[PDB]
Amino acid sequence: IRLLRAEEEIELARQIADLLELELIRDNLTLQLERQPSELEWGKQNKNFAAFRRRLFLDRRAKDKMVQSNLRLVVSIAKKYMNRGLSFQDLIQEGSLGLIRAAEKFDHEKGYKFSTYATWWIRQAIT
Amino acid sequence: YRTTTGGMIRYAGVEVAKGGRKQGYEVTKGGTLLWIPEETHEINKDISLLIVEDGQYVEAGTEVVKDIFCQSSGIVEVVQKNDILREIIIKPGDFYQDVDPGSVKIESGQLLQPGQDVFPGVTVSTLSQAEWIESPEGGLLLRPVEEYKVFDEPAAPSQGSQNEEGGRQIELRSVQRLFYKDGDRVKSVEGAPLLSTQLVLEIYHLSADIELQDDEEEDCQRLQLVILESLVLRRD
């Protein structure tokens, strides 16, 4: 998998931030729609429903692209922890759970790189 | 040949011959050389982190742009393509009030002589380069150039050898090598050297040599670029 550039981390973070507001609306609507918001689309308020699924698929692919491409950072951190209690296989899977949480809380408006903020979350999930 | 910031470079009547654009370029003759400096900053910040405008003259007190401290003083210029900052072009020089912007655009590629004037009523001290900026409510800017003296051959010492010169002769040559051409600017903000007075040898793709510090005339050390082969000698 090819690594991301410095400008591609800012672009993918905007669709993840667009995915944060899309799941916050669904979490506020599931308390009054009998926990079944399959067709209840509050963001649109045949062409609008097809464009809503295209934006939902493109935003989930951006979160799919940021965690999958930054998997070399998990190996460089978990290689310094493979002596205490766990094997090398279990540390990358636990470190990848911190890379998912780092992608949701990454704020591109502050200006810092993704490798600076995700190091604090991969090392937290390993420890 | 150690400027403060980076910038463009263009020679005038200086021929060169090279085989690769990576490890410099060996010069052949002399000639004059110009240098138009401009500070650059290849960053990847956002637009909301920018606190200046397009064409705002900054000072050397703080000069904070995109939460990054600068080192020069001049007219700033940002580059935006897809809501991400790519380069911060800062052109140093003096800013003077002027009018008639339709005439200063044609003076962007001509060398401004110090004996002439850039505008009727506006004077200049030395030679510069005219450039107009697109700032709100308006004058053009003057970017000064820097000239240097280069030699076709530097001060090379007298080489001395003690051999029969049969099939194997070595010497030392001191040549100058430039790193940048006229149609390319440098992407640097710190001090970048322009040339390097090196010492290139030419044996007249094998026969590596070993140098050492050998001296017997005085009580000091002297370099000796010699070449030797070790022969076997049994202790029997």
List the resolution, Å: 3.1
Of B63, B43, B42, give the one whose Cα is nearest residue B188: B42
Kindly list the residues from chain B whose CB atom is less than 8 angstroms away from the CB atom of residue A108: 46
> What tokens were used for A6?
């410095």
Which residue type sits at B189? V
Angstroms from B164 CA to nearest CA on chain A: 59
Angstroms from B45 CA to nearest CA on chain A: 6
With beta carbons less than 8 A apart as the criterion, state whether B176 and B151 touch.
Answer: yes
- Alpha-carbon gap, residue B181 to B24, rounded angstroms: 9
In this structure, what is the dihedral angle of CA atoms A77, A81, A85, A90, given to the nearest 10 degrees? Answer: 20
Residue B66 touches partner A, C-beta closer than 8 Å: yes
Please list, residue by residue across B115-135, b when 16 or more beta carbons sit within 10 angstroms of its beta carbon and e when fewer do: eeebbeeeebeebbbbbbbee
Task: Look at the block and give the residue holding tokens 């009054």.
Answer: A32
With beta carbons less than 8 A apart as the criterion, state whether B91 and B75 touch.
Answer: yes
Please provide the DSSP assignment of A80-98 as one string.
TSTTSSS-HHHHHHHHHHH
Residue A11 touches partner B, C-beta closer than 8 Å: yes
- Best B45, B48, B64, B68 member to test A by mutation, with max A CBs in 10 Å, is B45
Residues 6+ apart with CB under 8 A from B97: B122, B139
Determined by cryo-EM
- Alpha-carbon gap, residue B212 to B214, rounded angstroms: 6
- C-alpha to C-alpha distances, A22 to A10, A34, A41, A43, B210, nearest whole angstrom: 19, 19, 10, 8, 70
Residue A92 sits at φ, ψ, to 5 deg, of -75, -35
The secondary structure element, H or E, covering residue A55 is helix A47-69
Total CB pairs under 8 A between chain A and B = 19
Do A7 and B67 count as a contact with CB atoms less than 8 A apart? no
- Alpha-carbon gap, residue B17 to B175, rounded angstroms: 13
Give just the sign of the alpha carbon dihedral B125, B128, B132, B136: negative
Count of helix runs (H) and strand runs (E) in chain A: 5, 0
- Alpha-carbon gap, residue A84 to A37, rounded angstroms: 46
Which conformational region is residue B121 in: left (phi greater than 0), alpha (psi within -120 to 50 degrees), or beta? Answer: left
With beta carbons less than 8 A apart as the criterion, state whether B112 and B130 touch.
Answer: yes
Could you report how far apart the first and last alpha carbons of chain A are, in Å?
A: 27
